[PDB]
Amino acid sequence: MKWAYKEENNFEKRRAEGDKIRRKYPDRIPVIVEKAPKSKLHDLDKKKYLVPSDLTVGQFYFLIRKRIQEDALFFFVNNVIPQTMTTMGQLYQDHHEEDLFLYIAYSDES
C-alpha cells in the first residue's frame, strides 16, 4: 500500500513535523489514516489526527466511523489488526514509524 501522505511529503518533511508535534503535543498521538486502496469504503479526505494517548482503538473506530459512513470496518497497523481495548498511546509506541507518525489503514475486509 502506498500512502498519499508519504507520496506528498518526503521523510525530511514528515519527520520535521513529527518532531514538532511530539514537542508541542506530549499528550496526543499523531495518526495518519488512509483507506486500503482496493476497499469499497468511502475514502477519507481528512487523514491527519491528533488523538489523546488514553483514547482506545475502539473509541477511534467510533470517531472514524462517524466520518466514513451495514458494512464492517477494520484497522490495520503494520499488517495486524489491533485490539479494540488497546490505547492509542500503546499502539503508537509499538507501531510508529521513524518519522514519529502512526499509520493506520482501514478496510471492509479482515
Binding site: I21, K47, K48, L63
Partner: peptide, 9 residues
C-alpha cells in the same frame, strides 16, 4: 491539510 485535534482534552 491541517492536523485535526480529535476528541476533547
Amino acid at each position: 491539510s491541517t492536523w485535526e485535534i480529535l476528541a476533547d482534552d
